[PDB]
Amino acid sequence: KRLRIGITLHPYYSYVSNIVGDKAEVVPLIPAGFNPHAYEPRAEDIKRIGTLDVVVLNGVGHDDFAERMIASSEKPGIPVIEANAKVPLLAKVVNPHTFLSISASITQVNTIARELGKLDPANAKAYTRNARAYAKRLRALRADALARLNKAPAADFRVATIHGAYDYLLREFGLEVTAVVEPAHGIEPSPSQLKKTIDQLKALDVKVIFSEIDFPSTYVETIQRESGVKLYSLSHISYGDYSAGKYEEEMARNLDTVVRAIQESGAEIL
Ligand code: NI
Numbered sequence: 001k002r003l004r005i006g007i008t009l010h011p012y013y014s015y016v017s018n019i020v021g022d023k024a025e026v027v028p029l030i031p032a033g034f035n036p037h038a039y040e041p042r043a044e045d046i047k048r049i050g051t052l053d054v055v056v057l058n059g060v061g062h063d064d065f066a067e068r069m070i071a072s073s074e075k076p077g078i079p080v081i082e083a084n085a086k087v088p089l090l091a092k093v094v095n096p097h098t099f100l101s102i103s104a105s106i107t108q109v110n111t112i113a114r115e116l117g118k119l120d121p122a123n124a125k126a127y128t129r130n131a132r133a134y135a136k137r138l139r140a141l142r143a144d145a146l147a148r149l150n151k152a153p154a155a156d157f158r159v160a161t162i163h164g165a166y167d168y169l170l171r172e173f174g175l176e177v178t179a180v181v182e183p184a185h186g187i188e189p190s191p192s193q194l195k196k197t198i199d200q201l202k203a204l205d206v207k208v209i210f211s212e213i214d215f216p217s218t219y220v221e222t223i224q225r226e227s228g229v230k231l232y233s234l235s236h237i238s239y240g241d242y243s244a245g246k247y248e249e250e251m252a253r254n255l256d257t258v259v260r261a262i263q264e265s266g267a268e269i270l
Pocket of ligand 1: 037062097163165185186236
């Protein structure tokens with residue numbers, strides 16, 4: 001019988017779909033429409049784990065809801081694939097958004113394809129071959145996007161983000177995130193925390209803010225008004241329907257947006 005593979009987040013649906021092709025079923029643990037930051041496990045979803053053979057986990061802080069779901073299920077001892085086993089993690093609390101990096105995605109894809117190959121040896125060769133072809137497309141995505149960068153960002157080019165999602169993404173450009181607006185992962189800032197953030201943006205002369213496309217924040221225009229910073233939006237790859245192509249479609253948009261913020265910070269003759 002065909003493997004039934006549980007996934008927790010949209011990038012993982014894309015990774016597994018691209019690895020298995022038509023040789024296994026990819027099943028989301030939470031229905032399309034839920035914000036995974038806000039999701040609380042339902043009996044309906046807990047029941048579905050009983051029909052699965054394995055669950056692929058981010059397991060580094062972005063799907064603790066999944067481990068609770070499995071604990072409360074008919075199958076508490078279900079095999080689990082820890083996708084981030086070989087991924088260098090930053091760092092205290094680990095930033096769990098490793099899926100928003102092309103290089104960490106490739107590492108994750110390879111770990112998953114290997115682990116799935118052991119559970120289903122009949123399709124192991126297909127899983128390994130598909131992982132290699134998906135990785136090749138991912139490297140090309142990054143290469144084409146980085147080639148459009150005329151210059152590296154200037155020394156004073158400082159970046160802020162609303163959600164703490166993009167440290168792994170910006171590392172691909174050799175950049176760091178100067179400040180994150182949300183005080184903690186998926187936590188909304190209070191008026192005093194937002195004032196503190198604005199003071200920091202001004203004091204450190206932060207040039208750009210990457211806001212959320214997926215579940216936008218209501219306070220973003222105040223930050224832009226009060227600090228004069230340029231606004232660009234990025235995708236956490238957490239909204240809408242699950243699809244095999246979702247990850248590369250949205251990562252291509254994310255890389256192009258980062259390139260555009262860097263080119264737009266570049267001055268000409270004056
Ligand atoms: Ni997040």
